[PDB]
Amino acid sequence: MPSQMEHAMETMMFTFHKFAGDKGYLTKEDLRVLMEKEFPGFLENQKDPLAVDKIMKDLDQCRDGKVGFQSFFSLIAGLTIACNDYFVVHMKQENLYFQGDSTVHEILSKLSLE
Amino acid sequence: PSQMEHAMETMMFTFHKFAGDKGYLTKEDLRVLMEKEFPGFLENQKDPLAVDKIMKDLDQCRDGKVGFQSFFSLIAGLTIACNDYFVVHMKQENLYFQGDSTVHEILSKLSLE
């Protein structure tokens, strides 16, 4: 009986710890693996093989090879906020119904890192 | 069916469900959102002004309107705090917690500074 928001939060918490493991942080490689499983289209769609390295570089509180949870959350903030802006510009006015397990995947394919 | 992509959709569409056409949340919209999506949370706070206080502490929140990034900073603040709690009290510790939702349980342990 968790609400939808509570379960979403739990998903994000547990996803971090799944790839972080006991050391409690993500290396660059950890983050790469995380992204390839959780944002399947995404890295490869970018026309840049240093994409994860650039992302890693632009994550708040992220400076000695390690990505903590707060830093991990800033990644999700950046992605979701950009997805929302796309949705508001291009999708919201155009349909009353949106597909679950589909729309954010579709929008992520439209994004590139600055 | 990526769990992360699903969770993002939840956060985006939850905001728009409660913000409606105007595309932002009022204090009242936020109160109704929190009451449904963080059941028990506000009531557990010992404070009839908890929502007013929360708004005050949101990011890019200045004229009575909560936009999406503002909303996201609320989710961030709650989730980061839940994670700190989890790391300290539930992860290594060892566990045997049998609730249906660990985030529901941890949320009942938080208050605003």
């Binding site: 992302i55 632009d58 994550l59 708040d60 509180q61 707060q70 959350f73 800033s74 990644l75 903030a77 950046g78 992605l79 906020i81 950009a82 802006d85 796309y86 439209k110 994004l111 590139s112 890192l113 600055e114 | 990011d59 900073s73 961030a76």
Partner: peptide
Amino acid sequence: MKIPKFTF
């Protein structure tokens, strides 16, 4: 919180 910028 610093946030990376993605564009479309």
